[PDB]
Amino acid sequence: GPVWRKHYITYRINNYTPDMNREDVDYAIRKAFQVWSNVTPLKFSKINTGMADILVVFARGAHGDFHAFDGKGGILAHAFGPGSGIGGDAHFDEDEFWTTHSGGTNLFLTAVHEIGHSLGLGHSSDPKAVMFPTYKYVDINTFRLSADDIRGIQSLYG
Ligand SMILES: CCCCCC[C@H](CC(=O)O)C(=O)c1ccc(C#Cc2ccc(Cl)cc2)cc1
Ligand SMILES: [Ca+2]
Ligand SMILES: [Ca+2]
Ligand SMILES: [Ca+2]
């Protein structure tokens, strides 16, 4: 049907992963959402029934990701552009070992990046902006966002 929205976005979480703790995914995804929403004119909303805009699914390198990247570290996940259905969703290398709160890779870091890809604009290309390709494990404790960066996205279409 006729799709043309620019404020209210939908979201859906996969089966809470097989390993990754569900409560952990909700907390990490919740915090990232507030950071992306509180810095954006477009509010977001998760559900668990009807179709949604940003869909988060856990899979191992196979369906793409450049002939299946890794499954034990390296990258964490990726997301596509707009569109419908599949478009706007992301895939996290579930095969690997994810660590909630601490122990390695946090869901928050991937949640913020994955989310920004769906809504957030282009990247910065610079070892500092929460979007750049270069991966660097960093507990959310230091996950800080430049005022100019967040202010630019909110000031653009907001
Ligand atoms: C050109 C292909 C890019 C692949 C790079 C790996 C992939 C990119 C993506 O998420 O889309 C990935 O899984 C990934 C890459 C970077 C990060 C990060 C980060 C980060 C580091 C430090 C700070 Cl302060 C903030 C964020 C996460 C996942
Ligand atoms: Ca990985
Ligand atoms: Ca989608
Ligand atoms: Ca896993």
Ligand SMILES: [Zn+2]
């Ligand atoms: Zn993928």
Ligand SMILES: [Zn+2]
């Ligand atoms: Zn990116």
